[PDB]
Amino acid sequence: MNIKELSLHELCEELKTPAWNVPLTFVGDVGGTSARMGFVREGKNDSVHACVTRYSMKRKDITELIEFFNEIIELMPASVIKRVKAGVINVPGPVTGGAVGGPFNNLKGIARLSDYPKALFPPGRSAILNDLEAGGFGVLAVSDAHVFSEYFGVMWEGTQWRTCEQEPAGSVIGRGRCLVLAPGTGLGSSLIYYNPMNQQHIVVPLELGSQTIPMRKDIDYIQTLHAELKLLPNYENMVSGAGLEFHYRQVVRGSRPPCSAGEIAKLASEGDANACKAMKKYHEYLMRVGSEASMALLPLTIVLVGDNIVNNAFFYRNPQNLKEMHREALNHEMERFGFQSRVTYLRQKKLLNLNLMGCYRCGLDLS
Amino acid sequence: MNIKELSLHELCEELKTPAWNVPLTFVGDVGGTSARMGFVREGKNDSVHACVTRYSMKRKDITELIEFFNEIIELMPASVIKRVKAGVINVPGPVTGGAVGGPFNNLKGIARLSDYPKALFPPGRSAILNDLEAGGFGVLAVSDAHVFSEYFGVMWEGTQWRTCEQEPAGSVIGRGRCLVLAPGTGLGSSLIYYNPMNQQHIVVPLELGSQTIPMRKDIDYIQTLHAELKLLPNYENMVSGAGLEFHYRQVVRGSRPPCSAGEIAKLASEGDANACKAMKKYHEYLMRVGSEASMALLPLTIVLVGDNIVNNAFFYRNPQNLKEMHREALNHEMERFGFQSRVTYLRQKKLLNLNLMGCYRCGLDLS
Numbered sequence: 036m037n038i039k040e041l042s043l044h045e046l047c048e049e050l051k052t053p054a055w056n057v058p059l060t061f062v063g064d065v066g067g068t069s070a071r072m073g074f075v076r077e078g079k080n081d082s083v084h085a086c087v088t089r090y091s092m093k094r095k096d097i098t099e100l101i102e103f104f105n106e107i108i109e110l111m112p113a114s115v116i117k118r119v120k121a122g123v124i125n126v127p128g129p130v131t132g133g134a135v136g137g138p139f140n141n142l143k144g145i146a147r148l149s150d151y152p153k154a155l156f157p158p159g160r161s162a163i164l165n166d167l168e169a170g171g172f173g174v175l176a177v178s179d180a181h182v183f184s185e186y187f188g189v190m191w192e193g194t195q196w197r198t199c200e201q202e203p204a205g206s207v208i209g210r211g212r213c214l215v216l217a218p219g220t221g222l223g224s225s226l227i228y229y230n231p232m233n234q235q236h237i238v239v240p241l242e243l244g245s246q247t248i249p250m251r252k253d254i255d256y257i258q259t260l261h262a263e264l265k266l267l268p269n270y271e272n273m274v275s276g277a278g279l280e281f282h283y284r285q286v287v288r289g290s291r292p293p294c295s296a297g298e299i300a301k302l303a304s305e306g307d308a309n310a311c312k313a314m315k316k317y318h319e320y321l322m323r324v325g326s327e328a329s330m331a332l333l334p335l336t337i338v339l340v341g342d343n344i345v346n347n348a349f350f351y352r353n354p355q356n357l358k359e360m361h362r363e364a365l366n367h368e369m370e371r372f373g374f375q376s377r378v379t380y381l382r383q384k385k386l387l388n389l390n391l392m393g394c395y396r397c398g399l400d401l402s
Numbered sequence: 403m404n405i406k407e408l409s410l411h412e413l414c415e416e417l418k419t420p421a422w423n424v425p426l427t428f429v430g431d432v433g434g435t436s437a438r439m440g441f442v443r444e445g446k447n448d449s450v451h452a453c454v455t456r457y458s459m460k461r462k463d464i465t466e467l468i469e470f471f472n473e474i475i476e477l478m479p480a481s482v483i484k485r486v487k488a489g490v491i492n493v494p495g496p497v498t499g500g501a502v503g504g505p506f507n508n509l510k511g512i513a514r515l516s517d518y519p520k521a522l523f524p525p526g527r528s529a530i531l532n533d534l535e536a537g538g539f540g541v542l543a544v545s546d547a548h549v550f551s552e553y554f555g556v557m558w559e560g561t562q563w564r565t566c567e568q569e570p571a572g573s574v575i576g577r578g579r580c581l582v583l584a585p586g587t588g589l590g591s592s593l594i595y596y597n598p599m600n601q602q603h604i605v606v607p608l609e610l611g612s613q614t615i616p617m618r619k620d621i622d623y624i625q626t627l628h629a630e631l632k633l634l635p636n637y638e639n640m641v642s643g644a645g646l647e648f649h650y651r652q653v654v655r656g657s658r659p660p661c662s663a664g665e666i667a668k669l670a671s672e673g674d675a676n677a678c679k680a681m682k683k684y685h686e687y688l689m690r691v692g693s694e695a696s697m698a699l700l701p702l703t704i705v706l707v708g709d710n711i712v713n714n715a716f717f718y719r720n721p722q723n724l725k726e727m728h729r730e731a732l733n734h735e736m737e738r739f740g741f742q743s744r745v746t747y748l749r750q751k752k753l754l755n756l757n758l759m760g761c762y763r764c765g766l767d768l769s
């Protein structure tokens with residue numbers, strides 16, 4: 036279970052070692068700021084090994100990936116380019132058919148698997164994933180690698196865990212639906228559906244973040260944001276970089292100049308009461324995605340993934356914040372039946388690019 | 403594709419005919435009021451014959467089902483019970499592990515597969531489905547029989563359709579996500595997911611009805627029901643029997659008398675303005691479910707199913723109500739990127755028991 040980040044040149048060098056003679060999967064984790072492309076292999080002992088290289092989404096244009104793909108094949112021995120079983124990339128948007136991606140909120144243009152090289156993307160063994168679909172696949176990879184507890188911690192157990200499972204919560208993904216949320220630049224969601232007929236997990240990409248926020252007792256707070264965006268706020272408007280910034284502005288009341296999402300998180304890590312309140316506010320709305328999705332989708336587990344999540348561990352480690360989140364997760368009318376208390380919440384507690392493992396894990400199903 | 407309903411006696415008689423000395427599938431359609439149970443055979447050239455009997459949920463308890471199975475067993479010879487190869491029932495509630503059902507809204511108790519007699523429920527070849535999970539399967543069954551355009555009409559064709567499908571809209575399910583909605587007594591919802599990897603369709607049960615309603619410009623309207631319920635309204639509160647009645651009582655303000663739901667749709671068919679106004683408001687919220695779910699689930703199609711939709715066909719054929727339903731389906735901030743209008747909307751136009759067909763098709767996958 037491991038990935039080594041390299042420059043394009045050291046990548047080429049590495050790709051000639053005797054360890055990298057096995058058949059290979061081309062993977063790419065594309066974001067709105069940067070992309071990470073490279074190759075994955077199993078070596079020995081059920082171990083996953085990848086080395087990738089970072090590219091900057093400079094033009095901020097999804098089609099720039101075509102360029103990078105070329106730049107790889109040219110500058111690389113075709114005694115390696117031939118060992119390519121499958122090509123799988125993820126992109127930060129809705130993907131249709133596994134072959135067309137867009138429109139994007141970060142970028143412009145459309146991801147088209149047809150306009151991709153076939154040395155990197157062998158026909159019938161190639162897919163374009165939504166990033167959180169790749170992440171879901173990754174979550175599945177972590178479970179099959181028997182290492183779930185190493186990357187995910189329980190935030191609190193739901194009622195339904197012990198009725199489906201004898202193992203401790205956090206030790207396995209569990210024979211139930213698992214909803215994956217990624218609160219980052221944007222707000223990513225996917226549902227790892229569980230088919231009880233055949234006991235199979237299947238990743239279903241979702242756009243939970245773009246739904247209109249339903250109310251609680253916060254009609255005014257929503258209205259304030261509504262008036263800034265000229266749009267009915269959706270969850271992502273409240274749970275995202277711009278959302279955290281918004282919450283900070285509402286907290287200070289102009290008495291401090293606006294600072295960035297990242298900076299707000301730093302301040303909270305440093306104990307700043309204003310930032311900290313902004314963080315709590317952000318998490319109040321994350322937990323609303325949770326309680327609504329818990330009803331609609333009935334998951335056995337909800338899992339919070341991403342580097343944001345791992346890095347903000349100072350926040351989840353605090354049991355007062357955790358109880359307030361727990362409180363808000365149950366703040367749904369249907370809780371009087373226990374529907375929100377069914378669910379187990381976990382969070383990623385250790386850095387791992389779930390999307391990269393996801394692309395490779397998906398590559399297996401294609402071949 | 404053909405279902406004769408009988409009674410216990412003539413059922414036990416029917417099953418002695420040598421057209422029924424063939425592999426049998428036990429099916430059960432459990433509504434909130436009645437329950438249809440019987441057996442399904444295959445016959446000459448992809449012919450699917452079903453034979454069922456009716457029951458009453460007079461105790462309004464799900465566990466009562468177990469005593470119906472007992473009756474069937476005893477009054478049924480061992481000659482024919484032995485031929486049961488699969489048993490599949492649907493129930494009007496959330497189901498877990500295809501085995502535990504509940505809690506229910508219209509009924510008390512919990513549906514346990516572990517309590518059902520193994521004569522009708524062969525272990526490893528039987529399941530409990532949610533009613534719309536079963537309807538989902540039914541929808542697939544209709545498509546496979548190449549008879550889709552017979553039972554479903556196109557309300558409007560969405561943008562993503564000609565791009566994913568060459569066949570005309572309405573003539574096949576389509577290689578895309580299909581969101582099934584059943585606005586009847588309760589608001590049912592299931593999502594037939596299409597996995598572009600293996601080209602397989604999967605049915606994913608949802609509870610969209612019980613999520614808290616997002617606002618448009620209807621705060622006061624929502625507050626009013628909120629006040630009557632002492633509960634934050636969810637889509638089902640607006641789209642259901644109780645929801646239609648409520649829309650009526652808000653039209654007349656007290657003038658005319660309060661009617662039952664069926665009565666209101668009746669008055670609307672005949673032309674009553676109060677009634678037609680009430681059904682427009684109901685469909686305004688039905689369309690908001692689709693609007694919000696179109697974003698969250700990215701369906702290629704939305705299909706409205708139920709005896710309701712066939713019976714109230716007059717409302718949908720009216721080119722005026724359709725233009726208005728269309729306008730509400732696109733009433734979503736995310737429409738500025740075309741998300742809502744991607745989706746093709748169809749309605750059931752001919753009576754058919756989707757759930758019973760569904761139980762049978764699920765049964766076939768379990769064998």
Ligand SMILES: O=C(N[C@@H]1[C@@H](O)[C@H](O)[C@@H](CO)O[C@H]1O)OCc1ccccc1
Pocket residue numbers: 127128129137138139140141165166167217221222223224242244245739
């Ligand atoms: O792009 C998104 N949604 C994306 C998701 O697909 C993705 O999983 C998530 C994590 O990167 O970021 C969201 O912003 O919605 C479609 C959209 C939104 C806004 C403008 C155009 C298109």
Ligand SMILES: O=C(N[C@@H]1[C@@H](O)[C@H](O)[C@@H](CO)O[C@H]1O)OCc1ccccc1
Pocket residue numbers: 372494495496505506507508532533534584587588589590591609611612
């Ligand atoms: O029962 C349901 N939901 C049911 C659905 O499962 C079903 O598909 C639909 C059509 O029959 O009616 C809804 O009311 O949710 C659980 C619940 C809801 C409200 C109160 C108690 C329990």
